[PDB]
Amino acid sequence: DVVMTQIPLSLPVNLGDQASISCRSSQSLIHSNGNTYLHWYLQKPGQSPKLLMYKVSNRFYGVPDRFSGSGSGTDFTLKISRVEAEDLGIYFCSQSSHVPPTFGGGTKLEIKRADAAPTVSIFPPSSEQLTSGGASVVCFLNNFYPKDINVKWKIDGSERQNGVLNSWTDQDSKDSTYSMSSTLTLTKDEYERHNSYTCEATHKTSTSPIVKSFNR
Amino acid sequence: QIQLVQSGPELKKPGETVKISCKASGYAFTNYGVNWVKEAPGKELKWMGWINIYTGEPTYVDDFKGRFAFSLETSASTAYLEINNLKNEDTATYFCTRGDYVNWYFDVWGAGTTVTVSSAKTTPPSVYPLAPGSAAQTNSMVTLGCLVKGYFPEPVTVTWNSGSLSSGVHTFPAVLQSDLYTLSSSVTVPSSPRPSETVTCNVAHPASSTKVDKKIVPR
Numbered sequence: 001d002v003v004m005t006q007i008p009l010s011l012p013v014n015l016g017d018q019a020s021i022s023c024r025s026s027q028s029l030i031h032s033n034g035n036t037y038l039h040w041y042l043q044k045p046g047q048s049p050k051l052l053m054y055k056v057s058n059r060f061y062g063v064p065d066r067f068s069g070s071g072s073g074t075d076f077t078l079k080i081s082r083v084e085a086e087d088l089g090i091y092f093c094s095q096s097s098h099v100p101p102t103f104g105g106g107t108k109l110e111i112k113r114a115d116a117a118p119t120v121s122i123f124p125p126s127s128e129q130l131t132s133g134g135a136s137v138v139c140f141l142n143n144f145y146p147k148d149i150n151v152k153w154k155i156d157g158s159e160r161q162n163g164v165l166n167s168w169t170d171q172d173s174k175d176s177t178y179s180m181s182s183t184l185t186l187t188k189d190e191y192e193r194h195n196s197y198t199c200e201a202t203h204k205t206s207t208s209p210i211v212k213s214f215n216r
Numbered sequence: 217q218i219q220l221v222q223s224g225p226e227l228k229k230p231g232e233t234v235k236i237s238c239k240a241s242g243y244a245f246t247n248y249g250v251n252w253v254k255e256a257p258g259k260e261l262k263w264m265g266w267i268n269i270y271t272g273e274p275t276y277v278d279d280f281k282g283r284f285a286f287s288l289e290t291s292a293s294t295a296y297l298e299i300n301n302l303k304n305e306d307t308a309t310y311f312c313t314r315g316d317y318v319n320w321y322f323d324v325w326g327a328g329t330t331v332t333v334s335s336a337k338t339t340p341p342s343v344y345p346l347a348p349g350s351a352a353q354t355n356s357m358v359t360l361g362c363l364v365k366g367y368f369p370e371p372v373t374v375t376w377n378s379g380s381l382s383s384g385v386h387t388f389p390a391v392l393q394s395d396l397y398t399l400s401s402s403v404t405v406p407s408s409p410r411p412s413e414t415v416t417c418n419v420a421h422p423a424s425s426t427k428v429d430k431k432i433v434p435r
């Protein structure tokens with residue numbers, strides 16, 4: 001299967017600039033018939049994909065001339081002249097020359113902002129849950145950019161790796177940042193075996209970790 | 217308008233069967249193939265197979281051999297994909313696209329149809345409050361949050377103060393624990409509001425006709 005690998009995964013375009021997505025094939029997309037069938041889709045949030053352009057460089061009906069395509073043989077490059085808010089979402093390059101048409105990659109166009117560090121909050125198990133014998137510790141890593149963040153749960157100093165559950169929110173519509181919660185859930189007995197529970201946030205924007213704790 | 221119109225969202229247990237409807241209109245049905253596309257969480261957009269209106273017969277890509285069956289009822293312009301003996305791994309969104317014989321692209325995509333496979337029975341969530349345990353003004357600000365844990369099926373709706381609090385609200389996407397859903401929301405307010413003034417989260421689970429209001433009381 002011709003595996004399309006395209007990167008970057010996230011393109012923090014600065015609205016208004018020229019942006020370049022590139023895509024590459026694990027084979028030549030050059031057919032016996034003497035043409036290249038590399039196509040380009042665009043899928044806005046929670047929706048169906050759209051045909052954007054076909055055969056490496058032909059704009060499908062609708063696609064304003066802001067979109068431009070290019071390449072040959074194995075490397076391709078979709079290019080947006082001056083980006084516009086209307087055209088942000090994930091981008092897929094599928095080729096229909098060999099069997100099967102493989103879709104690869106997925107490059108999402110996101111916005112670029114000044115680096116932000118996270119408003120990391122930590123919460124102990126509310127009475128209600130303890131009374132039912134569960135124990136959920138909740139750390140809220142809030143309002144930060146860039147999108148990647150590494151979280152560590154140290155319980156008595158010793159790191160825990162299992163009992164975890166992370167969830168992110170994609171770029172906030174009105175403040176270009178991200179957010180994530182880390183939910184270390186453990187049994188009440190595992191819980192009151194110890195004091196000290198701490199959340200650890202190693203992020204681009206900081207010299208040393210961001211730590212947060214409560215002592216049970 | 218010209219489109220492929222697909223069936224509604226299915227919730228099936230394992231070993232069942234699903235028949236997704238792909239009804240075409242506005243265009244000459246016989247002279248385009250109907251292609252099918254599986255989209256899976258995190259997984260790639262994976263071309264599943266094809267259906268030839270001309271001749272009828274259908275082509276399957278290896279992965280979707282046999283259990284997946286490409287039907288067709290031409291008079292009626294509808295195309296069908298059927299999965300039998302749903303494994304828990306079939307949870308995805310299925311697209312049907314209008315495939316073109318000349319440039320071989322897929323230009324008219326259907327809205328999609330989500331299959332969710334699970335042996336979980338309808339369950340109400342447990343709305344726990346999460347009050348600080350005593351932290352200070354980071355810089356004159358407080359953040360509370362509710363933890364809607366243990367439900368099925370999706371979705372749950374969480375509002376603070378019944379819609380009044382939008383900003384600072386970050387409802388995180390439902391994640392899974394043993395078939396059931398666990399999800400959380402956080403609201404951030406100025407130190408003046410709490411506790412001078414009340415903050416609450418309203419958790420509604422339409423699936424089981426339950427609305428819960430847990431008032432965040434201090435610690």
Ligand SMILES: CC(=O)[C@H]1CC[C@H]2[C@@H]3CC[C@H]4C[C@@H](OC(=O)CCC(=O)O)CC[C@]4(C)[C@H]3CC[C@]12C
Nearest residue numbers: 096097098099248249250251266315316317320321
């Ligand atoms: C109408 C319709 O549905 C269209 C949409 C996409 C089209 C298919 C896309 C892939 C190509 C592969 C081609 O390559 C080859 O010649 C074989 C050798 C190789 O694959 O490298 C042969 C036909 C097919 C399979 C196309 C037939 C018609 C399709 C199905």
